[PDB]
Amino acid sequence: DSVECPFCDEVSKYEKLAKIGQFGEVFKARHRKTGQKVALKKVLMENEKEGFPITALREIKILQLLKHENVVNLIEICRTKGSIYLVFDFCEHDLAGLLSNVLVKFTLSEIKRVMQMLLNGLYYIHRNKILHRDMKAANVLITRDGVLKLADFGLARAFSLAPNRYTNRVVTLWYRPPELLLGERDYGPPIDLWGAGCIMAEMWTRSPIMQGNTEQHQLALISQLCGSITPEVWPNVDNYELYEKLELVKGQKRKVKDRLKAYVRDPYALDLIDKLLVLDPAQRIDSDDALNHDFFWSDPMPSDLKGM
Amino acid sequence: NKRWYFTREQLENSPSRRFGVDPDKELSYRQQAANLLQDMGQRLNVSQLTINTAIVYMHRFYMIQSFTRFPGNSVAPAALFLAAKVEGQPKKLEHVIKVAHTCLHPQESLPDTRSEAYLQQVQDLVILESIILQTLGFELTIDHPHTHVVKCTQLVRASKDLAQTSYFMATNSLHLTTFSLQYTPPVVACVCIHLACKWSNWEIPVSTDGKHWWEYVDATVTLELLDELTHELLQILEKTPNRLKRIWNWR
Ligand SMILES: CC[C@@H](CO)Nc1nc(NCc2ccc(-c3ccccn3)cc2)c2ncn(C(C)C)c2n1
């Protein structure tokens, strides 16, 4: 016998076309009737001994809530006739594969735009009490018609003003903020804005700017580009236990603008990056105040994308 | 958006009816499931919010599925298992099997956690949770009248007492009625304040505008409807033993 199921379609209505990722198992696919291309994330029921995975529920909670031109779009959820597929609009590019490919080239106008869409995408989700927690170029997709989308809300979680006790083991190392590396469990938006700083740089450098082998190593690269962590710079750092219980230089001066003059020419662009890569979270630029930065309001003005 | 709101003509012609189940009967199959849910939820030390969510899941679930194929005693634990995850109060699958068991078989001893018998019922629950998910088509973010209750009670400077009563009404509207399948949270909330007031002889000074307390909460709400519904709710409250004594003024 079979069971009635009006609001879950069998994923067989799409035809798979190709693997593309890389948590978890992600295919491009085509709707058998219309040709509409989509992406399908299978939900991995392996090592899942507690029924349908709570984190999948979290993500699906969040994707249903975040509806916005700069946030990836969950179209529907599908079953087989056993597992479960998340179904998104398909995005033709991702910013990582654009920054590696060397024929791809960015004008200042095109870059201002990308950043603008990305800072807007952030403002939106933060405004909706969501933390993305996985900033990295590889999670920043772009569409053929040139619109940017943020992706992988697999690590996203909601946040509030309750003190909090959020997980620390978040964010790819190369994009993890200082705050986190010092064992902080009461953080918020400014962690996502650190990511954006790194990606903003990665726009002129084609490469992740701080590639560390471990926390120790990483934190050291950061204190090397943004100076040492002192309470004169970042008031109340001493309050953390991992503070002294860790090797950190002491004679380090902020070379944020110095090291990047090479690839980044625009001085407004530099001034912006410098407010994104700020050690102290509570002094690190808002996603609002950043969109309001003279970088977005000076020539060249931000332009559309056809430099594909 | 109107997906899980149904007319009285739709509510009558329900999956269960089409398998011979009388209206009055189906109606008490729900009440029963709701009891099981509350019973289990208190022993599992989860919130009322979580219990309420599970109940709404149960309600919507049976607007698609029939009681003649899916027994309440099977759906209720799986629905609560789910609601608890979805609401941040996750309870362990083995833990929920245990409590469901003692609730449904207060005498019978628990099977060896290693037996083929027990290994099945765990399988079953997990399968069921999967069917509930697909049946709801993964829409698990519920909104309960209770949120709106706070709001309506600032709008009458109501005492603790009257406030608590309104919540009581709210929670009971889920156990005892199919309102959550017919009227939006905000409306139901107004119904719950209306009857809490009636039950307490609490007075509502018309605003200076000639405006009533409710129009501030939901435009679509008419007293003609408020009276109609608080009647319906009160009617079944009276049918339900001991429930009213809970808010009766013994003094
Ligand atoms: C965490 C998410 C990351 C990790 O995998 N990725 C990702 N990349 C996409 N595309 C950009 C691309 C498009 C096509 C390919 C390709 C590769 C081989 C063969 C054919 N095509 C690869 C990447 C993409 N498009 C829609 N989605 C949703 C599921 C959000 C997408 N998610």
CSV table of N, CA, C and O in Angstrom, one decimal, chain A residues 34-117:
chain,number,residue,atom,x,y,z
A,34,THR,N,9.9,21.5,-17.9
A,34,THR,CA,10.1,22.9,-18.2
A,34,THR,C,11.5,23.3,-18.5
A,34,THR,O,11.8,24.3,-19.1
A,35,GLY,N,12.4,22.4,-18.0
A,35,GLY,CA,13.8,22.7,-18.3
A,35,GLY,C,14.5,23.5,-17.2
A,35,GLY,O,15.7,23.5,-17.1
A,36,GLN,N,13.7,24.1,-16.4
A,36,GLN,CA,14.2,24.8,-15.3
A,36,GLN,C,15.4,24.1,-14.6
A,36,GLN,O,15.2,22.9,-14.2
A,37,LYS,N,16.5,24.7,-14.5
A,37,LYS,CA,17.6,24.1,-13.8
A,37,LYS,C,17.5,24.4,-12.3
A,37,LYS,O,17.1,25.4,-11.9
A,38,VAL,N,18.0,23.4,-11.5
A,38,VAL,CA,17.9,23.5,-10.1
A,38,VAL,C,19.2,22.9,-9.5
A,38,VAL,O,19.9,22.2,-10.1
A,39,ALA,N,19.4,23.1,-8.2
A,39,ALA,CA,20.4,22.4,-7.4
A,39,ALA,C,19.7,21.6,-6.4
A,39,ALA,O,18.7,22.0,-5.8
A,40,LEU,N,20.1,20.3,-6.2
A,40,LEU,CA,19.5,19.4,-5.2
A,40,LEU,C,20.6,19.1,-4.2
A,40,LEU,O,21.6,18.5,-4.5
A,41,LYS,N,20.3,19.4,-2.9
A,41,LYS,CA,21.1,18.9,-1.8
A,41,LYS,C,20.4,17.7,-1.2
A,41,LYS,O,19.3,17.8,-0.7
A,42,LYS,N,21.0,16.5,-1.3
A,42,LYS,CA,20.5,15.3,-0.6
A,42,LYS,C,20.7,15.6,0.9
A,42,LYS,O,21.7,16.1,1.3
A,43,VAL,N,19.7,15.2,1.8
A,43,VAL,CA,20.0,15.1,3.2
A,43,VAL,C,20.5,13.8,3.6
A,43,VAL,O,19.8,12.7,3.5
A,44,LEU,N,21.7,13.8,4.2
A,44,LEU,CA,22.5,12.6,4.5
A,44,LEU,C,22.1,12.0,5.8
A,44,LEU,O,22.3,12.4,6.9
A,45,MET,N,21.4,10.8,5.6
A,45,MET,CA,20.8,10.1,6.8
A,45,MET,C,21.8,9.0,7.2
A,45,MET,O,21.4,8.0,7.8
A,46,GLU,N,23.1,9.3,7.0
A,46,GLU,CA,24.1,8.4,7.4
A,46,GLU,C,24.7,8.8,8.8
A,46,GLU,O,25.0,10.0,9.0
A,47,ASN,N,24.8,7.8,9.7
A,47,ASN,CA,25.3,8.1,11.0
A,47,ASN,C,24.2,9.0,11.8
A,47,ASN,O,24.5,9.7,12.7
A,48,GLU,N,23.0,8.8,11.3
A,48,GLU,CA,21.9,9.6,11.9
A,48,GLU,C,21.0,8.6,12.6
A,48,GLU,O,20.1,8.0,12.1
A,49,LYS,N,21.2,8.6,13.9
A,49,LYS,CA,20.5,7.6,14.8
A,49,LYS,C,19.4,8.2,15.6
A,49,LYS,O,18.8,7.6,16.5
A,50,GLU,N,19.1,9.5,15.3
A,50,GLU,CA,18.2,10.2,16.1
A,50,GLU,C,17.0,10.8,15.2
A,50,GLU,O,16.5,11.9,15.4
A,51,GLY,N,16.6,10.0,14.2
A,51,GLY,CA,15.6,10.4,13.2
A,51,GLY,C,16.2,11.5,12.4
A,51,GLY,O,17.4,11.8,12.3
A,52,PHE,N,15.3,12.2,11.6
A,52,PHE,CA,15.6,13.3,10.8
A,52,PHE,C,16.5,14.4,11.4
A,52,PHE,O,16.1,14.9,12.5
A,53,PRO,N,17.7,14.7,10.9
A,53,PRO,CA,18.7,15.5,11.5
A,53,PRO,C,18.3,16.8,12.0
A,53,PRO,O,17.8,17.6,11.1
A,54,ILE,N,18.5,17.1,13.2
A,54,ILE,CA,18.1,18.4,13.8
A,54,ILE,C,18.7,19.6,13.0
A,54,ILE,O,18.0,20.6,12.7
A,55,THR,N,19.9,19.5,12.6
A,55,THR,CA,20.6,20.6,11.9
A,55,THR,C,19.9,20.8,10.6
A,55,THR,O,19.8,22.0,10.1
A,56,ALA,N,19.5,19.8,9.9
A,56,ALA,CA,18.7,19.9,8.7
A,56,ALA,C,17.4,20.7,8.9
A,56,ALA,O,17.0,21.4,8.1
A,57,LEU,N,16.8,20.4,10.1
A,57,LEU,CA,15.6,21.1,10.5
A,57,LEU,C,15.9,22.6,10.7
A,57,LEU,O,15.1,23.4,10.3
A,58,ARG,N,17.0,22.9,11.3
A,58,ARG,CA,17.4,24.2,11.6
A,58,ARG,C,17.6,25.0,10.3
A,58,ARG,O,17.0,26.0,10.1
A,59,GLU,N,18.4,24.4,9.4
A,59,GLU,CA,18.7,25.0,8.0
A,59,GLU,C,17.4,25.2,7.3
A,59,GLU,O,17.1,26.3,6.8
A,60,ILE,N,16.5,24.2,7.2
A,60,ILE,CA,15.2,24.3,6.5
A,60,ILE,C,14.4,25.4,7.2
A,60,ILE,O,13.5,25.9,6.6
A,61,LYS,N,14.6,25.6,8.5
A,61,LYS,CA,13.8,26.6,9.2
A,61,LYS,C,14.2,27.9,8.6
A,61,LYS,O,13.4,28.7,8.2
A,62,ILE,N,15.5,28.1,8.6
A,62,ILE,CA,16.1,29.4,8.2
A,62,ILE,C,15.9,29.7,6.8
A,62,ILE,O,15.7,30.9,6.5
A,63,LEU,N,16.0,28.7,5.9
A,63,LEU,CA,15.9,29.0,4.4
A,63,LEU,C,14.4,29.4,4.1
A,63,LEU,O,14.2,30.0,3.0
A,64,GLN,N,13.5,29.0,4.9
A,64,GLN,CA,12.1,29.3,4.6
A,64,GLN,C,11.8,30.6,5.1
A,64,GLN,O,10.8,31.3,4.7
A,65,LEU,N,12.7,31.1,5.9
A,65,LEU,CA,12.5,32.4,6.6
A,65,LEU,C,13.2,33.5,5.8
A,65,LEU,O,12.7,34.6,5.6
A,66,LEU,N,14.4,33.2,5.4
A,66,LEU,CA,15.2,34.2,4.6
A,66,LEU,C,14.8,34.1,3.1
A,66,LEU,O,15.1,33.2,2.4
A,67,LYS,N,14.1,35.2,2.7
A,67,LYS,CA,13.6,35.3,1.3
A,67,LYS,C,14.1,36.7,0.8
A,67,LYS,O,13.5,37.7,1.1
A,68,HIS,N,15.1,36.6,-0.1
A,68,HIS,CA,15.7,37.9,-0.5
A,68,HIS,C,16.7,37.7,-1.6
A,68,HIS,O,17.3,36.6,-1.8
A,69,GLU,N,16.8,38.7,-2.5
A,69,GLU,CA,17.5,38.6,-3.8
A,69,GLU,C,18.9,38.2,-3.7
A,69,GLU,O,19.5,37.8,-4.7
A,70,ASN,N,19.5,38.4,-2.5
A,70,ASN,CA,20.9,38.1,-2.3
A,70,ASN,C,21.1,36.8,-1.4
A,70,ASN,O,22.2,36.5,-0.9
A,71,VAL,N,20.0,36.1,-1.1
A,71,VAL,CA,20.1,34.9,-0.4
A,71,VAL,C,19.6,33.8,-1.2
A,71,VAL,O,18.5,33.8,-1.8
A,72,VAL,N,20.4,32.7,-1.3
A,72,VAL,CA,20.0,31.5,-2.0
A,72,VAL,C,18.6,31.2,-1.7
A,72,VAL,O,18.1,31.6,-0.6
A,73,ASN,N,17.9,30.6,-2.6
A,73,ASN,CA,16.4,30.3,-2.5
A,73,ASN,C,16.0,28.9,-2.5
A,73,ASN,O,16.2,28.1,-3.5
A,74,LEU,N,15.4,28.5,-1.4
A,74,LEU,CA,14.9,27.1,-1.3
A,74,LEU,C,13.6,27.0,-1.9
A,74,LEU,O,12.6,27.6,-1.4
A,75,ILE,N,13.5,26.4,-3.1
A,75,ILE,CA,12.2,26.3,-3.8
A,75,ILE,C,11.2,25.3,-3.2
A,75,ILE,O,10.0,25.6,-3.1
A,76,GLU,N,11.7,24.2,-2.8
A,76,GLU,CA,10.9,23.2,-2.2
A,76,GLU,C,11.7,22.0,-1.6
A,76,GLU,O,12.9,22.0,-1.7
A,77,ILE,N,11.0,21.1,-1.0
A,77,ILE,CA,11.7,19.9,-0.5
A,77,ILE,C,11.0,18.7,-1.1
A,77,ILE,O,9.8,18.6,-1.2
A,78,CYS,N,11.9,17.7,-1.4
A,78,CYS,CA,11.4,16.5,-2.2
A,78,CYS,C,11.9,15.2,-1.5
A,78,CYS,O,12.8,15.2,-0.8
A,79,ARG,N,11.1,14.2,-1.8
A,79,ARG,CA,11.4,12.8,-1.3
A,79,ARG,C,11.7,11.9,-2.4
A,79,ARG,O,11.6,12.2,-3.6
A,80,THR,N,12.1,10.7,-2.1
A,80,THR,CA,12.2,9.6,-3.0
A,80,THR,C,11.0,8.6,-2.8
A,80,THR,O,10.3,8.8,-1.8
A,81,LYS,N,10.8,7.7,-3.6
A,81,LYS,CA,9.7,6.8,-3.4
A,81,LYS,C,10.1,5.4,-3.0
A,81,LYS,O,9.4,4.7,-2.2
A,82,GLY,N,15.2,5.2,2.3
A,82,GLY,CA,14.6,6.4,1.7
A,82,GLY,C,15.1,7.7,2.3
A,82,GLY,O,15.3,7.9,3.5
A,83,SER,N,15.2,8.7,1.4
A,83,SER,CA,15.8,10.0,1.8
A,83,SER,C,15.1,11.3,1.3
A,83,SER,O,13.9,11.2,0.8
A,84,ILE,N,15.7,12.4,1.4
A,84,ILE,CA,15.1,13.7,1.2
A,84,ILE,C,16.0,14.8,0.6
A,84,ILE,O,17.2,14.9,1.0
A,85,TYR,N,15.5,15.5,-0.4
A,85,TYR,CA,16.3,16.5,-1.1
A,85,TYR,C,15.8,17.9,-0.9
A,85,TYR,O,14.6,18.2,-1.1
A,86,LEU,N,16.7,18.8,-0.6
A,86,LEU,CA,16.5,20.2,-0.6
A,86,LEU,C,16.6,20.7,-2.1
A,86,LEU,O,17.6,20.3,-2.8
A,87,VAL,N,15.7,21.6,-2.6
A,87,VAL,CA,15.7,22.0,-4.0
A,87,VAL,C,15.9,23.5,-4.1
A,87,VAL,O,15.0,24.2,-3.7
A,88,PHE,N,17.0,23.9,-4.6
A,88,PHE,CA,17.2,25.4,-4.8
A,88,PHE,C,17.2,25.8,-6.3
A,88,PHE,O,17.2,25.0,-7.2
A,89,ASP,N,17.1,27.1,-6.6
A,89,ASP,CA,17.3,27.6,-7.9
A,89,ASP,C,18.8,27.3,-8.2
A,89,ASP,O,19.6,27.2,-7.2
A,90,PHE,N,19.2,27.1,-9.4
A,90,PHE,CA,20.6,26.8,-9.7
A,90,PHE,C,21.3,28.1,-10.0
A,90,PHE,O,20.9,28.9,-10.7
A,91,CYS,N,22.5,28.2,-9.4
A,91,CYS,CA,23.4,29.3,-9.6
A,91,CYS,C,24.6,29.0,-10.5
A,91,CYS,O,25.3,28.0,-10.2
A,92,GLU,N,24.8,29.7,-11.5
A,92,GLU,CA,25.7,29.3,-12.6
A,92,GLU,C,27.2,29.4,-12.2
A,92,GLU,O,28.0,28.6,-12.8
A,93,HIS,N,27.5,30.2,-11.3
A,93,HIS,CA,28.9,30.4,-10.9
A,93,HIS,C,29.1,30.4,-9.4
A,93,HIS,O,28.1,30.6,-8.7
A,94,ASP,N,30.3,30.2,-8.9
A,94,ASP,CA,30.6,30.6,-7.5
A,94,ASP,C,31.9,31.4,-7.4
A,94,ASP,O,32.9,31.0,-8.1
A,95,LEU,N,31.9,32.4,-6.5
A,95,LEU,CA,32.9,33.4,-6.5
A,95,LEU,C,34.3,32.8,-6.3
A,95,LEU,O,35.3,33.4,-6.6
A,96,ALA,N,34.4,31.6,-5.7
A,96,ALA,CA,35.7,30.9,-5.6
A,96,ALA,C,36.3,30.6,-7.0
A,96,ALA,O,37.4,31.0,-7.4
A,97,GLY,N,35.5,29.8,-7.8
A,97,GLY,CA,35.8,29.4,-9.1
A,97,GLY,C,36.0,30.5,-10.1
A,97,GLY,O,36.5,30.4,-11.2
A,98,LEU,N,35.5,31.7,-9.7
A,98,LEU,CA,35.7,32.9,-10.5
A,98,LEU,C,37.0,33.6,-10.2
A,98,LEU,O,37.7,34.2,-11.1
A,99,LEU,N,37.4,33.5,-8.9
A,99,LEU,CA,38.7,34.1,-8.5
A,99,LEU,C,39.9,33.3,-8.8
A,99,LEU,O,41.0,33.8,-8.9
A,100,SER,N,39.7,32.0,-9.1
A,100,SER,CA,40.8,31.1,-9.5
A,100,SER,C,41.1,31.2,-11.0
A,100,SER,O,42.2,31.5,-11.4
A,101,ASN,N,40.0,31.0,-11.7
A,101,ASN,CA,40.1,31.2,-13.2
A,101,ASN,C,40.7,32.5,-13.5
A,101,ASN,O,40.3,33.6,-13.1
A,102,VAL,N,41.7,32.5,-14.4
A,102,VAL,CA,42.6,33.7,-14.6
A,102,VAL,C,42.1,34.6,-15.8
A,102,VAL,O,42.5,35.7,-15.9
A,103,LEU,N,41.2,34.1,-16.6
A,103,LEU,CA,40.6,34.9,-17.7
A,103,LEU,C,39.6,35.8,-17.2
A,103,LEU,O,39.4,36.9,-17.7
A,104,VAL,N,38.9,35.4,-16.1
A,104,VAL,CA,37.9,36.2,-15.4
A,104,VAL,C,38.6,37.5,-14.9
A,104,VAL,O,39.7,37.4,-14.3
A,105,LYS,N,38.1,38.7,-15.2
A,105,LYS,CA,38.7,39.9,-14.7
A,105,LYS,C,37.6,40.9,-14.2
A,105,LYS,O,36.5,41.0,-14.8
A,106,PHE,N,38.0,41.6,-13.2
A,106,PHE,CA,37.1,42.5,-12.5
A,106,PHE,C,37.5,44.0,-12.6
A,106,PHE,O,38.6,44.4,-12.3
A,107,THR,N,36.5,44.8,-13.1
A,107,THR,CA,36.7,46.3,-13.0
A,107,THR,C,36.3,46.7,-11.6
A,107,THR,O,35.7,46.0,-10.8
A,108,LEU,N,36.8,48.0,-11.3
A,108,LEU,CA,36.4,48.5,-10.0
A,108,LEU,C,34.9,48.6,-9.8
A,108,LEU,O,34.4,48.4,-8.7
A,109,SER,N,34.2,49.0,-10.9
A,109,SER,CA,32.7,49.1,-10.8
A,109,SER,C,32.1,47.8,-10.5
A,109,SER,O,31.1,47.7,-9.8
A,110,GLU,N,32.6,46.7,-11.1
A,110,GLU,CA,32.1,45.4,-10.9
A,110,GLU,C,32.3,44.9,-9.5
A,110,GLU,O,31.4,44.3,-8.9
A,111,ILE,N,33.5,45.2,-9.0
A,111,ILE,CA,33.8,44.8,-7.6
A,111,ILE,C,33.0,45.6,-6.6
A,111,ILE,O,32.5,45.0,-5.6
A,112,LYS,N,32.8,46.9,-6.7
A,112,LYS,CA,32.0,47.6,-5.8
A,112,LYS,C,30.6,47.0,-5.7
A,112,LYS,O,30.0,46.9,-4.6
A,113,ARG,N,30.2,46.5,-6.8
A,113,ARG,CA,28.8,45.9,-6.9
A,113,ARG,C,28.7,44.6,-6.2
A,113,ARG,O,27.8,44.4,-5.3
A,114,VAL,N,29.6,43.7,-6.5
A,114,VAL,CA,29.7,42.4,-5.8
A,114,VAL,C,29.6,42.6,-4.3
A,114,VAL,O,28.8,42.0,-3.6
A,115,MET,N,30.5,43.5,-3.8
A,115,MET,CA,30.6,43.8,-2.3
A,115,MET,C,29.3,44.4,-1.8
A,115,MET,O,28.8,44.1,-0.7
A,116,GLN,N,28.7,45.2,-2.7
A,116,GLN,CA,27.4,45.9,-2.3
A,116,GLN,C,26.3,44.8,-2.1
A,116,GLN,O,25.7,44.8,-1.0
A,117,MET,N,26.2,43.9,-3.1
A,117,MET,CA,25.2,42.9,-3.0
A,117,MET,C,25.5,42.0,-1.8
A,117,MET,O,24.5,41.5,-1.1
